[PDB]
């Protein structure tokens, strides 16, 4: 008998970096998905295992809204079965993903003049991320034979790197705000429905 707080995630003033993506747990509310699919301000709206129009008739136990910022080049990586720096080391979706990937250009907000360096992405990691894994480490990555001891140098690099957003960038290098909705249906009472 209410309306879910989907406005807190999409219309959020600040978004997190992709390596440290932010998850919002959605439960016990009435979800009006007509606000999303009827919005013409989205550049990407890909749903897997469900239909956008055929979602107000469904009920779910829990819904997970993941939000972060990436390049336009890396929007194709937010999908099942993709590889790359984002899919391998920052945000990984499973092969059996059930949800929708939504993204839109945020050059006007997340690209500063002089260079916005607050958004980061993980550049080095020993192994790929498991689905929905979140690595926030800053240990000095060892890419050589000698050990590092937590100091930068030859083959000892900082694992995170900055995007340095600026409006003059090409669209593939401009910031894009991504919201990933995960629909979960367990052997529990379903709390998130539609109209």
């Amino acid at each position, epitope marked *: 008998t209410n309306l879910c707080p989907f406005g807190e995630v999409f219309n959020a003033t600040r978004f997190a970096s992709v390596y440290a993506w932010n998850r919002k747990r959605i439960s016990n509310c009435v979800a009006d998905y007509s606000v999303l699919y009827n919005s013409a301000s989205f550049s990407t709206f890909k749903c897997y295992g469900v239909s956008p129009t055929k979602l107000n008739d469904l009920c779910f136990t829990n819904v997970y809204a993941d939000s972060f910022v990436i390049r336009g080049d890396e929007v194709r990586q937010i999908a099942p079965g993709q590889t790359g720096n984002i899919a391998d080391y920052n945000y990984k979706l499973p092969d059996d993903f059930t949800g929708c990937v939504i993204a839109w250009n945020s050059n006007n907000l997340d690209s500063k*003049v*002089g260079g916005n*360096y607050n958004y980061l992405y993980r550049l080095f990691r020993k192994s790929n991320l498991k689905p929905f894994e979140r690595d926030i480490s800053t240990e000095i990555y060892q890419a050589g034979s000698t050990p590092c001891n937590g100091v930068k140098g030859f083959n000892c690099y*900082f694992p995170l790197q900055s*995007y340095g957003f600026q409006p*003059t*960038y*090409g669209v593939g*290098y401009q910031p894009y705000r991504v919201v990933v909705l995960s629909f979960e249906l367990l052997h529990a009472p379903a709390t998130v429905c539609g109209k």
Partner: antibody
Amino acid sequence: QVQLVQSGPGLVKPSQTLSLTCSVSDGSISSSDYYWSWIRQPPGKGLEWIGYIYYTGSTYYNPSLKSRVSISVDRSKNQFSLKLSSVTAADTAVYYCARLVVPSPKGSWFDPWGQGTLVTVSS
Amino acid sequence: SYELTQPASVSGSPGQSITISCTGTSIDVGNYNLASWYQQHPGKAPKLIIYEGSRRPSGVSNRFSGAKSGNTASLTISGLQAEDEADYYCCSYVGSSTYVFGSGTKVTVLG
């Protein structure tokens, strides 16, 4: 290709305000892909970046001159100008305007350049 | 640090190769914040030779090549010619704040 034509007085008295204007031909200054900067070079010395301006009005100056520098843009007249206040003999230099390209975090460069305007600060 | 360091002068023989160093402190990884290089002849405005570390503008001779050894960018001029005698400046975005040019390198063709 693009062309930058500089203009302005070659003599500015001490404590006065240096004022220069750079006009863009064979290209629109209202391009979302480019910055419009000023670079100066004292005679016989090196190059110093002063600051640039976006076509919307946003500016980003060298903090070593931020207190004295004011860069404006006029997209209707396809020009952008420079103003340096409280000039001294240390400000006598050849001043250049250049298109600043920043398409990605890979790199950035200045191309093309104005032909240079020598401004002498003297009494 | 911010001051970008170049050799004051370098020299080489005609038809040979020379390399100009550009030393800074900001250690960027890989294809990130790649420097640029400029040629200035007396009484002329600077001319872009190298951008994004190694790419060249159209019309610039292939005798010019750029590289980087992690900490230092390098401009290499093969087959030295008399007109290559000029001043050369590297440029980079240092400390994610200001644009700095190198100290300046005066190339003199020997012989």
